Amino acid sequence: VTRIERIGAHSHIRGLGLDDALEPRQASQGMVGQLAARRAAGVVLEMIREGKIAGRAVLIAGQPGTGKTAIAMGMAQALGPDTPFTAIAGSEIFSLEMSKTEALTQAFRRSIGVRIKEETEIIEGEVVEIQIDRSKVGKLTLKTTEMETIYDLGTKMIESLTKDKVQAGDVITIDKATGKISKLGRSFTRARDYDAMGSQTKFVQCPDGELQKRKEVVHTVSLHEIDVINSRTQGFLALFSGDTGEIKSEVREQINAKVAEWREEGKAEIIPGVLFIDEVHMLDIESFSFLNRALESDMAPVLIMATNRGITRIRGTSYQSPHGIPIDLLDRLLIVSTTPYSEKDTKQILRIRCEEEDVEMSEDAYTVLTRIGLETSLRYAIQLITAASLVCRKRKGTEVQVDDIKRVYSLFLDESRSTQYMKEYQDAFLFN
Amino acid sequence: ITPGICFSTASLVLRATDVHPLQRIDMGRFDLIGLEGRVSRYEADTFLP
Amino acid sequence: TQRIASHSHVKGLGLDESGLAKQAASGLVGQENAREACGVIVELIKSKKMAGRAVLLAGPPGTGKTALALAIAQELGSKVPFCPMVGSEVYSTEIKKTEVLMENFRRAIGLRIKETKEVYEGEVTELTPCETTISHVIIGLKTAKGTKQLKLDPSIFESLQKERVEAGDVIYIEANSGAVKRQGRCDTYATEFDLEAEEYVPLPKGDVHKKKEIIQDVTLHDLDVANARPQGGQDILSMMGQLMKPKKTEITDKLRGEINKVVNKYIDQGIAELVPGVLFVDEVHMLDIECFTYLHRALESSIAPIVIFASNRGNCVIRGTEDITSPHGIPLDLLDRVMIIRTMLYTPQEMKQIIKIRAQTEGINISEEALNHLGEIGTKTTLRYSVQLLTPANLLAKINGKDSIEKEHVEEISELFYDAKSSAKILADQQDKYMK
Amino acid sequence: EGEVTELTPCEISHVIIGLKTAKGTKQLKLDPSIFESLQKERVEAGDVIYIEANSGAVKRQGRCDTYATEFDLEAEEYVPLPKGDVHKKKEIIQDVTLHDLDVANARPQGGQDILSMMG
Amino acid sequence: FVMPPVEAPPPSLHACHPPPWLAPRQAAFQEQLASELWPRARPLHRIV
Amino acid sequence: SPFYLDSLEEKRKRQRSERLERIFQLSEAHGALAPVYGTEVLDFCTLP
Ligand SMILES: Nc1ncnc2c1ncn2[C@@H]1O[C@H](COP(=O)(O)OP(=O)(O)O)[C@@H](O)[C@H]1O
Ligand SMILES: Nc1ncnc2c1ncn2[C@@H]1O[C@H](COP(=O)(O)OP(=O)(O)O)[C@@H](O)[C@H]1O
Ligand SMILES: [Mg+2]
């Protein structure tokens, strides 16, 4: 069937294609060429996995179509889902709700994962009888398939039971430490054959085993999630709405201290991750200045960046800098350069894309498409793969031929041909 | 002290968003935010399975 | 659509079974190559396996880019989500531009859910809670086809008491959720008082138990906004939140991923179907550099829809930049990621065909000489001006007592109204008098 | 306007109030909102109160002067008995602008309900 | 001491045949909100 | 059992089967979703 995840621009990439010595294979895990860049990415990946060093920045720079986002997706895939990988674009830090520096702080704190581990004793059973004498004192009877006992209730326990409207036949769990009662379900009897059911009622089997049980919960949360939880009274709602605002720095310092205390106590573990900012040249000079000192914290993730700009103008200034990035930040980061692909590399990438899309192409078609990709662009050839597959299927064919590629080349124009045709009729278009 | 403004509208307007139950699906099967503060990890992971 | 819009005559791309474009079909005249390209794009959208592919329709104004997009939408059908947006709609005062773009992206992705709904509806003849607390609720519902006794979950009693449900009221109960709506009193009790402020409703006609199997389409954005804020809630904070002004919020990527997981679960179960759909961005040149940069990332997602752009600009300045010019107002990096469909200008014969089609769509009879004069006017000034002259000319014909447009009516309308070029000439001849 | 002689709730609970002045006595039945306002003003038997029927605004002015000798330290402000009638109607000229009406009807605060305070 | 020159109740929505459930729901919501919040508004009595 | 009717009992047992199927489907539907965070995680992460 068709799931929500479909063939995208980087669906064929499963990893960086390296061996145990971080030597890149020519074509492994869906990546072709970029040997030096892939080796550098693997070194950075080992640095991320060790987690010892904080606030390391790497910039993937190169011409468009040279595999920068491909390398970033390969790094994300090779890194486990356990380790956080926050991928944002440069334009996403311009928010109407929070400042640019707040957006960058939240992006930094989303990239550090905290794995928590709480062990809690609970009582779990089906309610048999609740007798309350008069809201002063009462008794509660709970049962399993192998056990049954009666409990003496106090004032607060009676109030909590009356508030939750616990009745007979309900399967509930009670936390011994805090006394909070959550209802799991109700048992099914012959008399409970309802014709209409409430939105929260559900029928479950009576629990087996022993009435007293230990509950172990292990989950991975980020620092930003703890900040949002502790920002306001019902801050967990902002984890859905996103209406977080600007969290106070004192709250962040308290949460860092508390997380360190948990890590010392053994109740939590830190998993530093990666923050990938794609098209960083969109960041303003203020954002770069903030990044300069944000990476210097002991709770800063690895900052991977990718730009395709030459010596251009920094946003918010009139200065020219080699990547659109001020040289002060560029001195804080290692630059990984991507080289343009050759004819063989382009053909191998086209083969991988065809395999991903399940398209059969003749060798002459591959030669023509590789020539087109060298002449126009690699992405144009990749799109022509699917266009030619569709056209071939339209004429009830099974293998894409050169005629199909020529047909889709005539139907769909690249940038150069469109620009030429526009220049031919320049006066027709508006605001030249 | 002034009397309030009495704004009169068509009775059909107040039923514009209303959809009959036989004409709409149950949106509670996608309710993730409603589970917060009410459903625990124990129930979802260990008990119900 | 009773009223006639600008593209009310576009019924499809007009292709044949081989994908080739007929000269005049489905309300489209000419643009054969563009129509064939749009047919290939429609075949791409139907074959749901591709995500994030983007298409640009580039050509001079009035060449039919919007008409081609609407023809694509008609060819797909109402079952595929076609979300039309204008590039200037991203400048919201509540959320950032990237949030608007992602919301539209999620709007384009559709989810089809097949479900059988059960509702118990009828006049209440008995409402008896059974004490053991309340073990269950016994209700008696009456319809024209009989009476049914129902055992209710005790949680529904709170809903029944809140709605103030008594004997003689017409209610419905949802089997899956227990929701109760008291939709008035039965009209058999309308005479129980001479003056009560009650809404009396006829007794339902069918059975008490009504079953309907329905297929409803929802988009991912609907689930996102459904999970952005809580609903209901008897707590004080929830109630005070109900009074708060509803404002669009920057929905988190965590919530997006969780909703994607839920959708995948229901797809695997077999109760959901995915319809990738199409997002059409018109006047894309109104986007600034930040929007284009974000589109670079958004289009590369494995979850994004097919996006169709349209631009009539030539070599113009990108909106967010100082002096950077690009071929269509679109950065070369985004142009590298799109397949460009080129629309050409129309010959006089094609213009006459389009004018005739517009006349037929607007219910206007036009003579051959009037049509030829209109075509000459369109060649002189613009196709849009000639199309816009049909209805006023028909009105003058109707006033004069004629059921058809003659040449004199077209001449009179051309005298009454001016096109852009004539008005600009008048303005240039009287520069001093007009405001600067 | 008068001294409160009886404050009897009538079950939402209405209030039956008895007011006396130097000219007479009258018993009135008032809305539950007025009873809530009287409770908020801590009006008890013997207090001189002012009620505006148009706005439902209840003001407690003080304990009646006749009780100012009972104690030596009561922590009360005493007010003389009203010398007119219990029920009065006064016609006055109000100077308002169109903007004032627009503001009053756009951010209403005349209902004295919870929703007005919330807004 | 500052008093608004004019005081008005909120605009009321009137329909000939409204949904018979809207008004009871609004009344219940207002009643619950008042019962939960009016005791907390007593300190502002002198200001009001 | 002189007044026994086979059709009425067949209808009643079909109704009982439908009711049981509805109970099963609703019980499965009302506990299918797992929380994004959960009560335990939120309680752990919530400082005083
Ligand atoms: N080394 C590679 N192996 C496989 N595919 C690649 C490689 N480099 C680039 N591509 C493909 O080329 C397309 C554009 O490259 P990408 O890295 O996404 O953007 P850019 O390099 O221009 O920043 C992607 O769809 C990607 O799959
Ligand atoms: N090839 C065509 N066939 C039929 N109608 C057309 C064609 N091209 C344009 N039109 C009509 O002309 C009008 C203006 O065209 P429009 O779609 O606005 O062009 P653009 O989008 O380039 O401005 C539309 O109402 C459209 O229906
Ligand atoms: Mg890239």
Side-chain angles (χ1 to χ4, degrees):
Chain A
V1 298
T2 298
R3 286 163 70 86
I4 193 166
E5 294 177 317
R6 313 184 305 282
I7 296 177
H10 303 111
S11 298
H12 57 98
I13 288 168
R14 312 283 153 77
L16 280 163
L18 322 173
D19 46 29
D20 299 338
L22 295 198
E23 290 282 352
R25 296 174 199 118
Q26 171 58 49
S28 183
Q29 292 189 286
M31 284 206 77
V32 181
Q34 292 308 303
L35 304 182
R38 274 157 76 209
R39 189 158 165 76
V43 173
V44 174
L45 196 69
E46 284 305 290
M47 196 194 309
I48 293 150
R49 280 160 169 163
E50 282 211 332
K52 294 187 177 185
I53 308 302
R56 296 298 292 250
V58 173
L59 174 75
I60 317 180
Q63 298 165 40
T66 46
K68 306 177 292 290
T69 314
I71 285 158
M73 295 297 103
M75 277 186 282
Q77 290 285 305
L79 206 61
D82 304 335
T83 304
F85 190 97
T86 307
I88 76 169
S91 313
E92 287 180 300
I93 72 166
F94 305 105
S95 168
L96 263 60
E97 184 197 305
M98 67 202 162
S99 55
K100 297 181 280 290
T101 71
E102 176 68 21
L104 283 169
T105 306
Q106 292 194 17
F108 267 55
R109 295 181 73 84
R110 274 204 288 267
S111 291
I112 289 179
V114 180
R115 175 145 45 77
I116 67 164
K117 173 184 281 272
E118 184 181 1
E119 194 176 333
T120 295
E121 295 194 342
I122 56 163
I123 288 152
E124 187 199 60
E126 177 189 340
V127 178
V128 193
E129 286 282 352
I130 295 183
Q131 54 178 129
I132 298 154
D133 296 341
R134 74 278 190 190
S135 61
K136 302 177 181 170
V137 71
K139 302 190 178 182
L140 163 64
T141 299
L142 286 164
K143 77 167 178 175
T144 68
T145 66
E146 310 186 64
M147 207 167 286
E148 189 176 353
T149 194
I150 190 161
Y151 283 100
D152 294 1
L153 316 177
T155 55
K156 36 186 59 183
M157 183 55 59
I158 280 169
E159 191 263 348
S160 184
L161 277 159
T162 51
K163 182 159 58 197
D164 293 339
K165 204 170 65 179
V166 182
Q167 61 194 3
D170 280 347
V171 185
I172 69 170
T173 180
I174 305 175
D175 286 12
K176 286 180 60 192
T178 56
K180 68 195 294 174
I181 305 192
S182 65
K183 295 162 74 181
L184 303 166
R186 63 182 66 154
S187 54
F188 181 69
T189 50
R190 222 188 184 197
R192 287 191 185 104
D193 51 316
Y194 306 139
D195 276 311
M197 283 170 62
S199 63
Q200 291 179 351
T201 177
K202 65 192 178 295
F203 289 101
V204 303
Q205 293 185 45
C206 183
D208 59 310
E210 188 172 3
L211 273 160
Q212 286 179 96
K213 295 192 172 77
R214 276 195 178 212
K215 183 213 301 188
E216 186 179 1
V217 169
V218 174
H219 207 50
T220 306
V221 296
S222 62
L223 284 177
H224 167 252
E225 292 180 354
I226 308 164
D227 297 6
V228 174
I229 284 161
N230 294 294
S231 64
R232 45 183 288 181
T233 300
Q234 294 265 84
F236 70 96
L237 289 173
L239 283 174
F240 298 88
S241 74
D243 196 38
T244 308
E246 308 192 333
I247 306 186
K248 297 190 299 179
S249 63
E250 293 84 54
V251 172
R252 288 187 162 118
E253 293 190 322
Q254 278 283 109
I255 286 159
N256 282 20
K258 179 61 62 173
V259 164
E261 177 184 303
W262 292 340
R263 173 187 175 68
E264 282 180 26
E265 289 192 34
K267 303 192 305 211
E269 188 162 37
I270 318 301
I271 305 96
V274 192
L275 175 62
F276 176 51
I277 311 186
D278 204 8
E279 281 148 335
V280 174
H281 54 83
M282 278 298 107
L283 261 53
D284 293 332
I285 183 61
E286 307 289 330
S287 308
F288 293 127
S289 305
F290 184 78
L291 279 178
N292 268 319
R293 309 309 163 163
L295 289 169
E296 302 180 7
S297 172
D298 59 337
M299 297 299 284
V302 175
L303 179 62
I304 301 187
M305 293 181 276
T307 62
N308 58 1
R309 295 294 188 257
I311 296 149
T312 57
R313 174 182 152 277
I314 300 169
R315 288 196 73 215
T317 74
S318 57
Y319 310 129
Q320 305 280 325
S321 282
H323 294 273
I325 304 164
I327 206 70
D328 43 38
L329 184 59
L330 281 168
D331 289 345
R332 289 181 173 72
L333 57 85
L334 300 175
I335 305 174
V336 182
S337 299
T338 59
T339 46
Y341 295 107
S342 62
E343 177 191 327
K344 193 176 66 179
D345 301 313
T346 298
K347 193 171 287 169
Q348 200 68 249
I349 294 161
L350 292 177
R351 283 187 202 276
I352 282 177
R353 285 301 305 188
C354 291
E355 185 76 19
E356 181 77 3
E357 297 172 20
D358 311 299
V359 179
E360 297 287 341
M361 276 182 46
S362 72
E363 297 295 313
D364 293 303
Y366 271 115
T367 302
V368 171
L369 199 57
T370 308
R371 178 172 281 279
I372 289 165
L374 292 172
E375 282 179 16
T376 66
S377 77
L378 178 69
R379 270 184 273 238
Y380 181 62
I382 292 170
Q383 283 146 36
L384 291 189
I385 293 171
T386 318
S389 193
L390 290 155
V391 175
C392 177
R393 265 177 51 237
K394 193 70 173 178
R395 67 174 180 81
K396 288 146 288 170
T398 178
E399 186 185 62
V400 172
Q401 309 300 311
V402 178
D403 296 330
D404 308 327
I405 284 175
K406 294 290 181 67
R407 167 71 161 150
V408 302
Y409 186 82
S410 78
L411 276 180
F412 303 104
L413 306 173
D414 48 287
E415 185 265 306
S416 306
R417 285 185 286 152
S418 76
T419 303
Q420 284 181 354
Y421 281 125
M422 162 180 287
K423 271 184 184 96
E424 286 188 357
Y425 299 102
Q426 201 171 11
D427 67 326
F429 295 79
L430 302 195
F431 305 132
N432 283 276
Chain B
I1 313 299
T2 48
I5 290 178
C6 178
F7 167 54
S8 188
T9 197
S11 310
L12 212 64
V13 177
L14 309 183
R15 303 178 184 262
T17 305
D18 281 20
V19 171
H20 198 266
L22 295 172
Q23 311 287 338
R24 53 170 170 88
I25 61 186
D26 182 26
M27 278 279 122
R29 67 163 51 83
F30 310 105
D31 194 0
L32 281 172
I33 202 174
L35 310 184
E36 294 299 327
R38 195 241 307 166
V39 189
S40 67
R41 306 290 305 173
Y42 183 65
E43 184 179 334
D45 297 332
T46 302
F47 181 79
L48 277 184
Chain C
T1 69
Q2 196 42 66
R3 295 176 81 208
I4 301 298
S6 309
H7 321 276
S8 288
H9 65 284
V10 186
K11 313 297 187 194
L13 287 173
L15 309 183
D16 48 45
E17 293 88 5
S18 173
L20 286 185
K22 303 167 189 177
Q23 193 274 329
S26 296
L28 290 187
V29 167
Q31 293 282 1
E32 288 100 314
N33 207 71
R35 279 158 62 203
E36 288 152 38
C38 286
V40 181
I41 295 314
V42 164
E43 293 301 321
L44 170 80
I45 297 143
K46 278 172 192 271
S47 66
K48 313 172 185 182
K49 62 159 59 183
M50 298 303 301
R53 286 278 200 256
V55 160
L56 170 64
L57 287 149
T63 48
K65 310 179 293 291
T66 310
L68 278 162
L70 294 198
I72 284 170
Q74 295 284 333
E75 287 276 340
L76 294 172
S78 306
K79 59 192 177 183
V80 176
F82 181 83
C83 180
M85 80 168 296
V86 179
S88 59
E89 285 189 276
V90 308
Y91 298 100
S92 180
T93 65
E94 298 184 3
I95 47 176
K96 49 181 184 201
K97 298 172 292 201
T98 65
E99 183 59 37
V100 179
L101 284 174
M102 175 53 50
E103 280 176 17
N104 288 123
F105 266 53
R106 305 277 287 197
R107 263 173 193 120
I109 303 284
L111 184 69
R112 165 166 293 124
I113 295 143
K114 191 174 80 101
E115 172 153 53
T116 290
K117 300 285 294 185
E118 297 187 81
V119 178
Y120 297 107
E121 168 177 72
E123 170 190 356
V124 179
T125 55
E126 172 186 48
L127 180 53
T128 298
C130 288
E131 301 99 335
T132 193
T133 192
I134 303 175
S135 64
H136 60 256
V137 192
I138 298 284
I139 201 174
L141 293 181
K142 200 219 284 172
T143 45
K145 282 188 187 294
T147 310
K148 202 168 178 67
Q149 292 286 110
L150 300 165
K151 186 192 271 176
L152 290 180
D153 178 62
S155 303
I156 317 182
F157 190 74
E158 290 180 351
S159 303
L160 286 157
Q161 280 196 309
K162 285 182 188 294
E163 281 278 359
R164 295 179 179 178
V165 169
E166 299 281 347
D169 297 4
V170 180
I171 75 167
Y172 68 70
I173 308 186
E174 291 178 54
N176 67 289
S177 69
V180 178
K181 178 165 288 183
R182 178 206 172 268
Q183 40 194 19
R185 188 92 165 159
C186 204
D187 51 4
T188 62
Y189 291 98
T191 68
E192 76 180 335
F193 296 115
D194 304 306
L195 192 62
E196 186 158 300
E198 260 286 348
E199 172 81 3
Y200 293 103
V201 174
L203 182 71
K205 288 195 72 173
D207 203 2
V208 168
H209 179 214
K210 295 201 169 74
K211 254 178 168 185
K212 213 186 183 73
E213 180 166 29
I214 58 154
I215 288 156
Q216 197 196 322
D217 294 351
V218 301
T219 69
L220 295 190
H221 187 245
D222 308 344
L223 312 181
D224 287 20
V225 302
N227 288 291
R229 299 202 42 80
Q231 295 295 321
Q234 298 181 5
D235 296 343
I236 179 54
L237 286 178
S238 298
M239 288 181 65
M240 293 167 70
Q242 278 165 17
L243 286 160
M244 280 181 71
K245 186 191 182 166
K247 203 187 69 69
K248 290 185 275 202
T249 44
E250 306 173 12
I251 300 174
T252 59
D253 294 1
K254 181 81 163 166
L255 184 49
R256 258 80 179 257
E258 295 295 328
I259 288 163
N260 293 350
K261 291 180 186 179
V262 176
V263 166
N264 272 340
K265 175 192 187 71
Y266 288 140
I267 282 171
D268 284 351
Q269 285 193 12
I271 75 167
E273 183 183 339
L274 197 80
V275 195
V278 180
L279 164 69
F280 174 49
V281 186
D282 208 355
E283 317 294 330
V284 66
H285 42 81
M286 297 319 293
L287 300 178
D288 60 357
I289 195 70
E290 289 163 0
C291 293
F292 291 126
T293 289
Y294 181 72
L295 277 180
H296 294 178
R297 179 188 159 73
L299 290 176
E300 281 166 26
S301 182
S302 59
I303 304 169
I306 309 298
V307 188
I308 298 166
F309 300 114
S311 184
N312 52 40
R313 303 298 191 239
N315 202 261
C316 82
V317 177
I318 300 164
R319 278 276 292 164
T321 70
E322 287 187 338
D323 296 322
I324 304 171
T325 61
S326 289
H328 309 275
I330 305 166
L332 283 165
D333 288 300
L334 185 59
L335 284 185
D336 198 30
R337 298 176 157 83
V338 301
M339 289 193 284
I340 301 177
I341 303 181
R342 181 169 83 95
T343 61
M344 305 183 70
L345 295 159
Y346 294 119
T347 65
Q349 294 90 345
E350 288 163 328
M351 286 197 202
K352 263 172 58 182
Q353 291 178 71
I354 295 159
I355 290 162
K356 187 58 168 75
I357 286 176
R358 289 299 309 180
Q360 289 176 177
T361 308
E362 292 174 24
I364 292 174
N365 307 303
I366 177 160
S367 61
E368 187 72 20
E369 51 179 359
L371 194 79
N372 285 271
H373 194 51
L374 262 182
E376 283 183 38
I377 287 166
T379 303
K380 279 167 65 73
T381 67
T382 301
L383 168 67
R384 278 218 199 81
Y385 180 70
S386 292
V387 169
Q388 281 150 211
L389 297 197
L390 284 159
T391 290
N394 184 49
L395 285 169
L396 287 182
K398 193 190 302 294
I399 289 165
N400 285 35
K402 299 179 182 293
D403 57 346
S404 180
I405 287 183
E406 315 285 350
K407 190 183 177 183
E408 48 182 0
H409 303 132
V410 178
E411 290 189 324
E412 196 157 7
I413 286 298
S414 303
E415 285 277 2
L416 275 174
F417 301 97
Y418 295 83
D419 58 278
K421 302 180 188 291
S422 303
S423 192
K425 175 60 66 176
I426 291 166
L427 291 164
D429 289 352
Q430 308 191 32
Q431 298 163 38
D432 193 23
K433 280 174 268 284
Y434 282 88
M435 292 298 298
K436 315 304 182 294
Chain D
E1 178 177 38
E3 168 196 319
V4 168
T5 69
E6 170 166 356
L7 203 77
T8 293
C10 167
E11 184 173 32
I12 308 301
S13 178
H14 287 242
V15 62
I16 298 158
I17 191 171
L19 290 189
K20 67 181 288 184
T21 62
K23 298 293 183 182
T25 310
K26 181 162 288 184
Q27 285 203 233
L28 307 163
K29 174 98 164 208
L30 304 173
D31 305 354
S33 58
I34 298 172
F35 182 52
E36 187 204 305
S37 305
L38 283 156
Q39 285 175 323
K40 283 187 300 202
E41 286 285 281
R42 305 185 296 278
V43 171
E44 293 191 330
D47 289 341
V48 178
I49 70 167
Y50 183 102
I51 304 183
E52 187 188 6
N54 313 65
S55 62
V58 178
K59 169 76 187 284
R60 167 182 193 282
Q61 309 200 331
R63 184 82 186 283
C64 181
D65 170 78
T66 50
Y67 308 108
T69 306
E70 294 304 315
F71 299 131
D72 294 3
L73 277 174
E74 189 163 28
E76 270 284 359
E77 53 191 326
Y78 302 94
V79 170
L81 189 70
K83 306 306 190 169
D85 205 0
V86 173
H87 179 51
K88 296 175 178 169
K89 285 201 176 73
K90 186 68 178 178
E91 184 176 40
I92 47 157
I93 308 293
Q94 293 269 29
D95 283 276
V96 299
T97 72
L98 291 189
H99 178 60
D100 300 333
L101 290 153
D102 303 335
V103 164
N105 290 261
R107 268 294 175 267
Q109 49 195 1
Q112 281 292 90
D113 54 346
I114 187 59
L115 288 193
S116 68
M117 193 73 201
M118 295 307 276
Chain E
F1 48 79
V2 170
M3 307 177 297
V6 180
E7 196 196 291
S12 59
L13 174 72
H14 170 70
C16 297
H17 300 278
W21 52 84
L22 177 77
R25 273 176 199 179
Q26 185 68 210
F29 169 76
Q30 284 188 33
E31 280 173 23
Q32 192 171 4
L33 202 73
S35 63
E36 186 55 42
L37 288 180
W38 267 128
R40 302 187 186 259
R42 285 192 176 190
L44 303 177
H45 185 62
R46 293 305 300 147
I47 307 180
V48 177
Chain F
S1 310
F3 299 118
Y4 182 96
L5 297 104
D6 207 45
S7 182
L8 184 69
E9 291 303 316
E10 190 266 331
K11 185 196 309 292
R12 278 175 183 171
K13 68 169 66 67
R14 190 180 64 191
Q15 281 169 0
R16 181 187 79 193
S17 180
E18 281 192 288
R19 193 185 300 126
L20 290 173
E21 175 79 6
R22 188 192 295 119
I23 281 167
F24 178 82
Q25 292 292 111
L26 290 183
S27 298
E28 282 201 327
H30 292 169
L33 280 188
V36 181
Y37 296 103
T39 301
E40 297 101 333
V41 175
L42 291 190
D43 290 359
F44 185 89
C45 297
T46 307
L47 311 185

